[PDB]
Design a protein around this ligand. Structure first.
Ligand SMILES: O=C(O)c1ccnc2cc(-c3nc4ccccc4n3CCN3CCCCC3)sc12
Ligand SMILES: [Mn+2]
Length: 294
């Protein structure tokens, strides 16, 4: 039948007192959030960092994504932020025959998973994924000198929730940028070294997430290995994770607990250690993410 949305993951709305430092806050929500794999954090209403990327010079060549590439078993355009947004909005409004902001998030979700398994329709999108923040700057203001920081921006340049200020060292990395369009996606994966990840949506349409708690990681990997094609089943996990696309209902039918969320502009998503996650974008948006350890 049609897609059944997984239950919603926890959403936290901390006060200014609880919003003091992300490390301590993540530590306190851990008893609940680690049981759901992912969680969403809404900052206080007055916490609004200004977008600090060099929009004039922001040029990139996104990667081509064919939604049904696994069910089928020549694709190779430079955009600006503006020209990519025009292409993205035109694609979505043309696909759904309605203004982009009027398409329900549930409809994009059900259509995405239908297209992923559809053998009759071949939908192709583009994703500006894994763009280094060293190339055109971070979405957050930073004390760098390459871009002037206004007095109203210094608070955000020094904020602990600025992803450039996260601790990224283990015991013995820069944020990445993601320019999304409708149906652009990332498949199921965990982070290197089982690290945390934190993801901020600077602006645009929501990013839809799916998460699995770490206690079900082995269960997910066994389901993924049982249903993956024989050519990819024996591949190392770092390589298999490039094509690990799977409908969440298939995991839920095999007893895997899965949670979902729509990450809206200005909201954080935190993934916990060894919490498998995947998702897709509802439309033209801009996200920034970094891995960190506690
Ligand atoms: O799209 C989001 O918003 C999002 C949210 C959470 N996790 C992820 C992971 C993503 C991803 N797609 C890939 C396609 C090919 C190869 C690697 C890919 N990777 C991980 C990239 N990884 C290693 C290289 C440097 C950057 C970090 S996209 C994404
Ligand atoms: Mn990730």
């Amino acid at each position: 039948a049609e897609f059944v949305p997984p239950p919603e993951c926890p959403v936290f709305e901390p006060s200014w007192e609880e919003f003091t430092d992300p490390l301590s806050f993540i530590g306190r929500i851990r008893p609940l959030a680690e049981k759901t794999g992912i969680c969403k954090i809404r900052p206080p209403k007055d916490w609004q960092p200004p977008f600090a990327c060099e929009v004039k010079s922001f040029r990139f060549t996104p990667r081509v994504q064919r939604l049904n590439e696994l069910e089928a078993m020549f694709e190779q355009r430079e955009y600006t932020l503006q020209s990519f947004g025009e292409m993205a909005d035109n694609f979505k409004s043309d696909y759904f025959n309605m203004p982009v902001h009027m398409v329900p998030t549930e409809l994009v979700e059900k259509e995405f998973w239908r297209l992923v398994s559809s053998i009759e329709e071949d939908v192709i999108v583009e994703y500006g994924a894994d763009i280094s923040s060293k190339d055109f700057g971070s979405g957050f203001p930073v004390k760098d000198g390459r871009r002037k920081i206004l007095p109203e921006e210094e608070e955000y340049a020094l904020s602990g929730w600025n992803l450039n200020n996260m601790p990224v060292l283990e015991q013995s990395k820069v944020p990445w940028l993601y320019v999304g369009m409708c149906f652009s996606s990332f498949c199921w994966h965990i982070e290197d070294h089982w690290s945390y990840s934190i993801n901020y949506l600077h602006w645009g349409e929501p990013k839809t997430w799916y998460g699995v708690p770490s206690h079900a990681a082995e269960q997910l990997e066994e389901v993924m290995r049982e249903l993956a094609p024989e050519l990819f089943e024996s591949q190392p996990d770092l390589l298999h994770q490039l094509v690990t696309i799977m409908n969440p209902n298939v995991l839920m039918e095999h007893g895997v607990p899965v949670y979902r969320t729509n990450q809206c502009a200005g909201e954080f998503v935190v993934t916990f250690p060894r919490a498998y996650h995947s998702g897709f974008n509802q439309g033209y948006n801009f996200a920034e993410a970094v891995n960190f350890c506690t």
